[PDB]
Design a binder for this molecule. Structure first.
Ligand code: A1IRC
Length: 282
């Protein structure tokens, strides 16, 4: 679609927010990208010179998929793109607080500020975002706190850095076969039987909830991903309750970690359940 196209001379590129082996996301400023906000801060995903044609095809397809998702409050907001007469730029609205892991770490010590209600809100918003993606038949496959951004007003924005994360030198991604995988976030059917569904996303959402209510802890702390780890998961091992989880929130996580995928709750039902834990009703 040509509606998305934005001229390069209207885009200022700044510091790198994140980089992988062949892609990167840079902070930027866009001039004339909105009539109402003629000077607006953005993030821009682009390829590095290192990238080959396979990684260039993936960026164009990523743009194509993002155009077809349409907008949702809890997904990163696609604003425009640069495609003609140059390398592909994907322009997204800048999320003030950055990624959720670092946000949780920065606010862990002053936690009562950051409140339990804020954590419940993040939990609810992610579920609403994942519900949207599922409705578009998009399986995330890498849902984790590191792939959740936070905009001002404390609004969750699910994202996927993809090529802009160095999964080869990130401890959260374990070598398996030809590539590196977020094993500690993956459902057993994904690890051992290579099945990726919304229901496997629901497992990852449970791991994400553990991240939130541990205030950014590493899942299965101390445990290396090895054959001992793999066998524990198949045998029904699950993480204990994080410090700042209520019993209700822990029960939600355990439901997400059912060994049988069809027994995990939908992202829609998850939204309702978390809603009843929040004060007030709309
Ligand atoms: C169906 C599966 C699917 O579509 N997954 C998917 C794949 C790719 C994305 N793309 C992004 O998340 C994305 C692209 C480009 C850019 C620039 C950004 C960003 C950013 C940003 C904004 N503010 C900050 C602050 C610090 C660091 N980074 N910032 C993101 C998305 C998806 C999705 F899962 F959403 F569908």
């Amino acid at each position: 679609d040509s509606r998305w196209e934005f001229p390069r001379d209207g885009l200022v590129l700044g510091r790198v927010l994140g980089s992988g082996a062949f892609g990167k996301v840079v902070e930027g400023t866009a001039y004339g990208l909105s009539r109402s906000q003629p000077v607006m801060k953005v993030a821009v995903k682009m390829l590095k010179p290192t990238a080959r044609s396979s990684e260039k095809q993936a960026l164009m397809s990523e743009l194509k998929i993002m155009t077809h998702l349409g907008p949702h409050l809890n997904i990163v907001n696609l604003l425009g793109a640069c495609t003609k007469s140059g390398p592909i730029y994907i322009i997204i609205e800048y999320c003030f607080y950055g990624d959720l892991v670092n946000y949780l770490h920065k606010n862990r010590d002053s936690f009562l500020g950051l409140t339990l209600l804020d954590l419940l809100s993040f939990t609810y918003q992610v579920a609403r975002g994942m519900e949207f993606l599922a409705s578009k038949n998009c399986v995330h496959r890498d849902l984790a706190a590191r792939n959740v951004l936070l905009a001002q007003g404390k609004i969750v924005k699910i994202c996927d850095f993809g090529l802009a994360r160095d999964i080869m030198h990130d401890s959260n991604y374990v070598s398996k076969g030809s590539t590196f995988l977020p094993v500690k976030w993956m459902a057993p059917e994904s690890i051992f039987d290579n099945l990726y569904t919304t229901l496997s996303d629901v497992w990852s959402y449970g791991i994400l909830l553990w991240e939130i209510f541990s205030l950014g802890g590493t899942p299965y702390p101390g445990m290396m991903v090895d054959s001992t780890f793999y066998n524990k998961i198949k045998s029904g091992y699950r993480m204990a309750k994080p410090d700042h989880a209520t019993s209700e929130v822990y029960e939600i996580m355990v439901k997400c970690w059912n060994s049988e995928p069809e027994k995990r709750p939908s992202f829609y039902h998850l939204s309702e359940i978390v809603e009843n834990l929040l004060p007030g009703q709309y």
